[PDB]
Amino acid sequence: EDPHLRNRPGKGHNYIDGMTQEDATCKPVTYAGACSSFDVLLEKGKFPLFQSYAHHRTLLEAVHDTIIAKADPPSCDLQSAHGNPCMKEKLVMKTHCPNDYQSAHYLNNDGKMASVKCPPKYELTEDCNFCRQMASLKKGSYPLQDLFCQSSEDDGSKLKTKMKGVCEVGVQALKKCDGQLSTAHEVVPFAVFKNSKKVYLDKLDLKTEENLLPDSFVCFEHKGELKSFDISQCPKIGGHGSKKCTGDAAFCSAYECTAQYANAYCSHANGSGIVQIQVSGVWKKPLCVGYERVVVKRELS
Amino acid sequence: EDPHLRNRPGKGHNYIDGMTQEDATCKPVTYAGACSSFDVLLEKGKFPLFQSYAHHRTLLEAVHDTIIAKADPPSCDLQSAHGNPCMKEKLVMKTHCPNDYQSAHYLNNDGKMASVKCPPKYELTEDCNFCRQMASLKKGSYPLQDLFCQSSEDDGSKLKTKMKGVCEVGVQALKKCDGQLSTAHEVVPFAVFKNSKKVYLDKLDLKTEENLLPDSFVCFEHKGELKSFDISQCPKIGGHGSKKCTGDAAFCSAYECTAQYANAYCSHANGSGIVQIQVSGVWKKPLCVGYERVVVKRELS
Amino acid sequence: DPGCSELIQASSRITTCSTEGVNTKCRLSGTALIRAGSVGAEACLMLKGVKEDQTKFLKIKTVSSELSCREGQSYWTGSFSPKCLSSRRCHLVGECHVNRCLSWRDNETSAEFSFVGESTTMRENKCFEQCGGWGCGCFNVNPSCLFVHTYLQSVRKEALRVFNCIDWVHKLTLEITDFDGSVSTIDLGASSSRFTNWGSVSLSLDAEGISGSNSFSFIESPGKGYAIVDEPFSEIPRQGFLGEIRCNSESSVLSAHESCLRAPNLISYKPMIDQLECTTNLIDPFVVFERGSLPQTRNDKTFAASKGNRGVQAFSKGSVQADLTLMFDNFEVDFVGAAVSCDAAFLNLTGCYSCNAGARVCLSITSTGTGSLSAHNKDGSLHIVLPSENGTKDQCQILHFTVPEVEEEFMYSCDGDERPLLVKGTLIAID
């Protein structure tokens, strides 16, 4: 079912600094909104991870939540001069950027929001590396990775990519291989915690923990229809809060219903729970976990 | 709806006190008129018990016929947070009803007649528990309970709810549960007596006595106004009676059929007759037996 | 208790050494076979690079010998309580007929009992007949109909999973310790293989097993001990036997879901005009759970539960003879130089020789920093791996010898510099 394919908890901002052209509409991102930087993630047949975690936040919202740093510059220019830092990681990837797009955002090695752009009128190629002159022109960006973030506070700066067989993946130089080097493009996951680097993984094992959480509720705004409304404003049992909101029975059993004083109809849903990760044998809360499409360099015996 | 089932014996009044804005089409209840306090009772797939038993009375009709007393207050003014008596009796009930409503009546704990009230211009939510602000509203009162009323004076005040391992169900406060209870929404029938309480029954046995008794048939004034007409005043086979009456083979098998000389019309359809029920191991004649979906708290751990 | 029994060396054909940042590291990518120890013994693996002071131990601690069971067919069962409802209707009234109630379908809900709604519960729809006339509440001379709607629900707040075992797998509960210090607890049975952070491990030889388990069924209880039944597995539910109502999950039994099975013509009925008494003779497995509660002495073994993981096992008083297969998939092994130095002293020595118990060594490690003491003899056949920290602590492991007069000199080194050390102590003959 998933009746909350476009609901975004918290803020909801999805725009890269420096390349802002559709922010006048996607702030916030509602059901009737139009943003090319987020509709690509909802496409059926591209990123199944976000399809499964449809009720979960992403990376840009984590950048706008003041819980992770951003890259400088956040919008790299492809037509400036020699010395572009957003090339050693983009050229090693293997993606397929469709037409009618001139921007692409991803996650760098430092765990910051690093993106590229192209001034009009120049669109990307079939892989999004170079650029050429070409129907329409979307005023957003194209997602290159398939990752997701949340409100994690676990530290992970004392970790490092511990992979076997692979000699050098992405832009991190693990160990030096002197034997036969195999060049192939595979899918290698990564894990970025609070103030850490891009720590790659081998076997990602997620875990869902949903046991009465405040983020597992959606308040439908009263409209005569359907309209999004912020759920992070309902008080507790006899407590205090910002605005007023009520629901049926499951939503009113944990919060306070003000009858006619409320202008929102809450319900009961899931998907925005606490997501765990398997690393170092201890379950932790990841902050920037997903998958990569870079080249894999393995050492053969 | 079915216009043939709109005949209501007795006075046939369906209106709540305080908000008498809907009484032009529901006082009395005839074949014509547009009132939401009775058209919702004839919907297919909603209240089948009223369709099976349509020759008896309802709740308000029993109140206006000196059968069920009125509560205090009769109309719960839903204009404040808690405080009013019509609060905990409604939060524990789970009834589905469409929008565009205003008033609603149900059965309380003391077996009286309790209801709510929404001053203009307010409406109800998708469940009827709370209210909100906002097409045209229905001035009628949506019945929350699916029970039938009958004329009887059977004694029974020392009988309460006696289920099997149930903590708190509906508006009854049985025994406490120190452990973890099983909170679920189930449909458990109820039964009210003369000056008693809401008695729930798990193992119900319905009795239908339809024979030569005067209360086993139904009749109304009609040619060969629409009120009730007793059958004992009809003529006998080969004798003389006060008022004539006609009918089909069931009515003509015991009495006579005068057709042009009949001042009423009797029939034998599914919906009338003396009905009993099992309680305390014996047979007693109830006054209002229906089906409701409340919160059933069963034992677990 | 620590103590590496078997000692092997890494071959040069599967070891790749290099140097990154003035640090001689090795890469293991092969297969090393070693014999598994008994109860308490271990199987350490030391890494050797281009020098002699660089040594990375790979301790694998063996807990005890276990005999796990391979679960095949399984089903949930438990006690229930029938709750039937009756509603008699007159003849030619709605659906009251003399020929319809007799041939009524069980998978069809009439309009009389359709007042509740949707409910996923093992329910049935019967069809009984009664008498007519005004003596019981009827108008027509033809007989009336008595529709019965009975649904089954759980009366007890617990369920039991009855399963069986097709073969007893000798599971070896191991405890593999990584090179950096990460301790992992895994298990290997017969020829099963697990996955770790450094590769994979499996077995090679397993000469221990109990035959004859298809004629025995086990019962799982939510943390209240298991049970054993002396009868073959029940695959066809019928009346008069333990196992007539089954399902597929615990929630399907505790909440009574319609995804289970039951014996037909089991719920008895007592039609009495308008009365109904739903009484069933359900076989309660609690009596069998009480009369056959584990432990139960059978033949010459001991059947009980299991620790850590939920499952059934079997205790055996035999020898432990098995091997170990260590697989490597290009794992990086580094060595920074251990830590600081430290002084060692001998305490006592007791135990046995040429037996599965071993000899317990007593050592007193006195250092100032957190590290690990790595000792060795003269011929390279014995090693001592004990933790070290700031202070005077008493440590030791399990050693094996073939002579009651142990007179072997050891060479312990806290960070690279070796020191002479002589141990002694008598032993007793045991196997």
Side-chain angles (χ1 to χ4, degrees), chain B residues 47 90 93 95 104-106 127 142-146 291:
Chain B
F47 287 162
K90 185 67 176 68
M93 293 180 183
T95 61
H105 62 278
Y106 61 93
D127 57 353
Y142 179 75
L144 295 172
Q145 297 295 322
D146 191 3
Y291 293 95

Side-chain angles (χ1 to χ4, degrees), chain A residues 82-85 87-96 98-117 119-127 129-130 132-148 150-166 168-176 178-218 220-223:
Chain A
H82 295 285
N84 193 0
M87 293 304 295
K88 62 183 181 293
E89 191 177 1
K90 179 67 175 67
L91 290 174
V92 300
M93 290 180 183
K94 184 69 176 177
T95 60
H96 182 74
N99 297 114
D100 292 331
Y101 283 103
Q102 65 183 357
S103 178
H105 63 277
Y106 62 93
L107 186 65
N108 56 4
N109 196 3
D110 292 331
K112 293 179 181 180
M113 183 179 72
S115 179
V116 298
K117 65 182 181 180
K121 182 68 171 65
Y122 294 100
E123 292 180 354
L124 294 174
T125 62
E126 292 85 4
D127 56 354
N129 289 319
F130 290 165
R132 74 267 186 98
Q133 293 180 356
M134 189 62 78
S136 178
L137 182 63
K138 298 294 187 291
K139 293 181 181 179
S141 178
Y142 179 74
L144 294 175
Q145 295 179 357
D146 192 0
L147 78 159
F148 58 92
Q150 64 182 357
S151 66
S152 178
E153 292 179 353
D154 291 331
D155 195 1
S157 66
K158 294 181 176 67
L159 293 175
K160 190 62 70 177
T161 298
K162 299 298 293 296
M163 292 179 70
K164 62 179 72 66
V166 178
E168 183 178 1
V169 58
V171 298
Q172 294 179 356
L174 295 175
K175 82 280 289 179
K176 181 174 71 68
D178 291 331
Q180 184 66 41
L181 184 63
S182 179
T183 300
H185 294 89
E186 293 179 354
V187 176
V188 174
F190 64 95
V192 176
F193 289 165
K194 182 64 70 177
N195 297 114
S196 66
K197 302 294 183 182
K198 185 183 285 185
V199 176
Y200 293 99
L201 294 174
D202 196 2
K203 184 178 184 293
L204 183 63
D205 291 331
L206 295 175
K207 181 173 73 175
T208 62
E209 184 178 1
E210 293 176 352
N211 295 115
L212 294 174
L213 294 174
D215 291 331
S216 296
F217 294 101
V218 175
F220 286 163
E221 185 174 359
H222 294 170
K223 179 67 174 66

